[PDB]
């Protein structure tokens, strides 16, 4: 397992515009297009992102390219953020994937707000971090995915993704 396989499991792959768990227009492997309720706005963002007139549909190669861009952006968001970078740098490789997953789902600013969880992660207090991470809208709204990401932080293993 690696971060691409992990997020591919958590986000799926859809080649036509869909709504994500929050009702926002999305495509591919969890690529958010817009929070606007307008499908036309989402189609415009799609064409801008892909560089052609897509009419709401993309290829698997195009989805994978967006996904590469989005993972890269999540990692860069972590490295540029003064709250996130030291915690990330402190982690092992498996737990770094859990961090990237959170930033991919909720964005850099959102994750940087998890102040107490971040401290517990930096201190390697894994069970405490796991309990704190679950005290969140994130966990309550997407509990199966949050449970997988939290188990990954708790254990430093891929056990939550191995059954799938």
mmCIF file of C-alpha atoms in Angstrom:
data_model
loop_
_atom_site.group_PDB
_atom_site.id
_atom_site.type_symbol
_atom_site.label_atom_id
_atom_site.label_comp_id
_atom_site.label_asym_id
_atom_site.label_seq_id
_atom_site.Cartn_x
_atom_site.Cartn_y
_atom_site.Cartn_z
ATOM 1 C CA UNK A 1 0.000 0.000 0.000
ATOM 2 C CA UNK A 2 0.889 3.599 -0.708
ATOM 3 C CA UNK A 3 -0.963 6.901 -0.630
ATOM 4 C CA UNK A 4 -2.386 6.468 -4.147
ATOM 5 C CA UNK A 5 -3.846 3.047 -3.404
ATOM 6 C CA UNK A 6 -5.179 4.267 -0.044
ATOM 7 C CA UNK A 7 -6.996 7.290 -1.505
ATOM 8 C CA UNK A 8 -8.211 5.265 -4.522
ATOM 9 C CA UNK A 9 -9.982 2.981 -2.020
ATOM 10 C CA UNK A 10 -11.376 5.876 -0.010
ATOM 11 C CA UNK A 11 -12.509 8.024 -2.982
ATOM 12 C CA UNK A 12 -13.339 5.501 -5.704
ATOM 13 C CA UNK A 13 -13.158 6.280 -9.392
ATOM 14 C CA UNK A 14 -16.017 7.873 -11.324
ATOM 15 C CA UNK A 15 -15.559 9.268 -14.846
ATOM 16 C CA UNK A 16 -18.704 11.415 -14.928
ATOM 17 C CA UNK A 17 -19.449 14.384 -12.666
ATOM 18 C CA UNK A 18 -20.948 13.188 -9.379
ATOM 19 C CA UNK A 19 -21.749 14.666 -6.001
ATOM 20 C CA UNK A 20 -19.441 13.913 -3.119
ATOM 21 C CA UNK A 21 -20.505 13.039 0.429
ATOM 22 C CA UNK A 22 -21.223 16.736 1.113
ATOM 23 C CA UNK A 23 -23.268 17.200 -2.058
ATOM 24 C CA UNK A 24 -20.543 18.990 -4.046
ATOM 25 C CA UNK A 25 -19.784 18.377 -7.712
ATOM 26 C CA UNK A 26 -16.712 16.195 -8.056
ATOM 27 C CA UNK A 27 -15.133 13.932 -10.669
ATOM 28 C CA UNK A 28 -12.495 11.216 -10.958
ATOM 29 C CA UNK A 29 -10.812 10.141 -7.741
ATOM 30 C CA UNK A 30 -12.330 12.691 -5.422
ATOM 31 C CA UNK A 31 -11.429 15.780 -7.447
ATOM 32 C CA UNK A 32 -13.687 18.558 -6.149
ATOM 33 C CA UNK A 33 -14.841 20.804 -8.965
ATOM 34 C CA UNK A 34 -16.876 23.422 -7.089
ATOM 35 C CA UNK A 35 -19.059 24.016 -4.089
ATOM 36 C CA UNK A 36 -21.519 25.901 -6.262
ATOM 37 C CA UNK A 37 -24.924 24.244 -6.698
ATOM 38 C CA UNK A 38 -24.684 24.951 -10.442
ATOM 39 C CA UNK A 39 -23.871 21.939 -12.667
ATOM 40 C CA UNK A 40 -22.917 24.420 -15.395
ATOM 41 C CA UNK A 41 -20.339 25.994 -13.056
ATOM 42 C CA UNK A 42 -18.970 22.530 -12.326
ATOM 43 C CA UNK A 43 -18.741 21.720 -16.059
ATOM 44 C CA UNK A 44 -16.850 24.966 -16.620
ATOM 45 C CA UNK A 45 -14.385 24.108 -13.845
ATOM 46 C CA UNK A 46 -13.991 20.662 -15.337
ATOM 47 C CA UNK A 47 -13.144 21.935 -18.809
ATOM 48 C CA UNK A 48 -10.642 24.413 -17.287
ATOM 49 C CA UNK A 49 -9.010 21.613 -15.269
ATOM 50 C CA UNK A 50 -8.685 19.165 -18.149
ATOM 51 C CA UNK A 51 -8.002 21.694 -20.917
ATOM 52 C CA UNK A 52 -10.799 20.669 -23.295
ATOM 53 C CA UNK A 53 -14.564 20.624 -23.581
ATOM 54 C CA UNK A 54 -15.472 17.502 -21.627
ATOM 55 C CA UNK A 55 -19.240 17.844 -21.264
ATOM 56 C CA UNK A 56 -18.977 16.323 -17.819
ATOM 57 C CA UNK A 57 -17.042 13.156 -18.677
ATOM 58 C CA UNK A 58 -13.323 12.330 -18.565
ATOM 59 C CA UNK A 59 -11.044 9.402 -19.303
ATOM 60 C CA UNK A 60 -9.368 7.179 -16.725
ATOM 61 C CA UNK A 61 -5.989 8.708 -17.723
ATOM 62 C CA UNK A 62 -7.406 12.198 -17.121
ATOM 63 C CA UNK A 63 -8.774 11.177 -13.727
ATOM 64 C CA UNK A 64 -5.388 9.730 -12.767
ATOM 65 C CA UNK A 65 -3.627 12.924 -13.847
ATOM 66 C CA UNK A 66 -5.927 15.050 -11.644
ATOM 67 C CA UNK A 67 -5.306 12.568 -8.849
ATOM 68 C CA UNK A 68 -1.519 12.949 -9.188
ATOM 69 C CA UNK A 69 -1.956 16.713 -9.074
ATOM 70 C CA UNK A 70 -4.217 16.528 -6.051
ATOM 71 C CA UNK A 71 -1.917 14.248 -4.023
ATOM 72 C CA UNK A 72 1.035 16.513 -4.900
ATOM 73 C CA UNK A 73 -1.015 19.530 -3.762
ATOM 74 C CA UNK A 74 -1.904 17.870 -0.459
ATOM 75 C CA UNK A 75 1.740 17.090 0.254
ATOM 76 C CA UNK A 76 2.786 20.631 -0.660
ATOM 77 C CA UNK A 77 0.031 22.028 1.531
ATOM 78 C CA UNK A 78 1.449 20.117 4.443
ATOM 79 C CA UNK A 79 5.047 21.154 3.775
ATOM 80 C CA UNK A 80 4.106 24.847 3.518
ATOM 81 C CA UNK A 81 2.023 24.919 6.683
ATOM 82 C CA UNK A 82 3.849 25.774 9.877
ATOM 83 C CA UNK A 83 1.441 23.720 12.021
ATOM 84 C CA UNK A 84 1.385 20.655 9.817
ATOM 85 C CA UNK A 85 4.956 20.277 8.627
ATOM 86 C CA UNK A 86 6.591 19.537 11.983
ATOM 87 C CA UNK A 87 3.991 16.893 12.809
ATOM 88 C CA UNK A 88 4.315 15.331 9.370
ATOM 89 C CA UNK A 89 8.109 15.296 9.554
ATOM 90 C CA UNK A 90 7.866 13.569 12.918
ATOM 91 C CA UNK A 91 5.804 10.672 11.551
ATOM 92 C CA UNK A 92 6.797 7.357 9.985
ATOM 93 C CA UNK A 93 5.934 6.598 6.365
ATOM 94 C CA UNK A 94 2.600 4.845 6.972
ATOM 95 C CA UNK A 95 1.293 7.536 9.290
ATOM 96 C CA UNK A 96 2.450 10.200 6.774
ATOM 97 C CA UNK A 97 -0.027 8.601 4.353
ATOM 98 C CA UNK A 98 -2.821 9.015 6.903
ATOM 99 C CA UNK A 99 -1.892 12.684 7.165
ATOM 100 C CA UNK A 100 -1.944 13.178 3.416
ATOM 101 C CA UNK A 101 -5.331 11.423 3.290
ATOM 102 C CA UNK A 102 -6.830 13.869 5.821
ATOM 103 C CA UNK A 103 -5.438 16.891 3.973
ATOM 104 C CA UNK A 104 -6.757 15.494 0.677
ATOM 105 C CA UNK A 105 -10.247 15.143 2.140
ATOM 106 C CA UNK A 106 -10.560 18.308 4.184
ATOM 107 C CA UNK A 107 -7.803 20.643 2.994
ATOM 108 C CA UNK A 108 -4.721 22.080 4.685
ATOM 109 C CA UNK A 109 -6.539 24.735 6.729
ATOM 110 C CA UNK A 110 -9.131 22.289 8.056
ATOM 111 C CA UNK A 111 -6.557 19.780 9.224
ATOM 112 C CA UNK A 112 -4.347 22.489 10.734
ATOM 113 C CA UNK A 113 -7.305 23.206 13.019
ATOM 114 C CA UNK A 114 -7.010 19.765 14.663
ATOM 115 C CA UNK A 115 -4.626 21.313 17.235
ATOM 116 C CA UNK A 116 -4.934 18.805 20.038
ATOM 117 C CA UNK A 117 -4.800 15.752 17.740
ATOM 118 C CA UNK A 118 -1.733 17.143 15.980
ATOM 119 C CA UNK A 119 0.059 17.587 19.312
ATOM 120 C CA UNK A 120 -0.785 14.037 20.353
ATOM 121 C CA UNK A 121 0.452 12.709 17.024
ATOM 122 C CA UNK A 122 3.728 14.655 17.351
ATOM 123 C CA UNK A 123 4.113 13.198 20.857
ATOM 124 C CA UNK A 124 3.429 9.656 19.524
ATOM 125 C CA UNK A 125 0.537 9.209 21.908
ATOM 126 C CA UNK A 126 -1.301 7.094 19.391
ATOM 127 C CA UNK A 127 -4.304 5.843 21.295
ATOM 128 C CA UNK A 128 -4.960 9.292 22.705
ATOM 129 C CA UNK A 129 -4.652 10.819 19.226
ATOM 130 C CA UNK A 130 -7.062 8.254 17.874
ATOM 131 C CA UNK A 131 -9.647 9.071 20.567
ATOM 132 C CA UNK A 132 -9.265 12.790 19.936
ATOM 133 C CA UNK A 133 -9.481 12.490 16.142
ATOM 134 C CA UNK A 134 -12.851 10.758 16.482
ATOM 135 C CA UNK A 135 -14.311 13.722 18.428
ATOM 136 C CA UNK A 136 -14.972 15.496 15.152
ATOM 137 C CA UNK A 137 -17.533 16.318 12.507
ATOM 138 C CA UNK A 138 -15.203 14.439 10.174
ATOM 139 C CA UNK A 139 -15.634 11.178 12.041
ATOM 140 C CA UNK A 140 -19.362 11.588 12.535
ATOM 141 C CA UNK A 141 -20.093 12.438 8.887
ATOM 142 C CA UNK A 142 -17.739 9.899 7.254
ATOM 143 C CA UNK A 143 -17.182 7.328 9.983
ATOM 144 C CA UNK A 144 -16.058 4.346 7.925
ATOM 145 C CA UNK A 145 -13.374 6.349 6.145
ATOM 146 C CA UNK A 146 -12.371 8.219 9.304
ATOM 147 C CA UNK A 147 -12.101 4.929 11.178
ATOM 148 C CA UNK A 148 -9.677 3.622 8.513
ATOM 149 C CA UNK A 149 -7.533 6.731 8.609
ATOM 150 C CA UNK A 150 -7.584 6.760 12.436
ATOM 151 C CA UNK A 151 -6.610 3.079 12.643
ATOM 152 C CA UNK A 152 -3.709 3.924 10.350
ATOM 153 C CA UNK A 153 -2.579 6.678 12.755
ATOM 154 C CA UNK A 154 -3.149 4.444 15.784
ATOM 155 C CA UNK A 155 -1.198 1.432 14.505
ATOM 156 C CA UNK A 156 1.178 2.633 11.847
ATOM 157 C CA UNK A 157 0.069 -0.319 9.713
ATOM 158 C CA UNK A 158 -2.176 -0.764 6.716
ATOM 159 C CA UNK A 159 -4.486 -3.173 8.562
ATOM 160 C CA UNK A 160 -7.622 -1.079 7.949
ATOM 161 C CA UNK A 161 -7.037 -1.139 4.170
ATOM 162 C CA UNK A 162 -6.052 -4.790 3.806
ATOM 163 C CA UNK A 163 -9.528 -6.317 3.766
ATOM 164 C CA UNK A 164 -10.367 -3.069 1.956
#
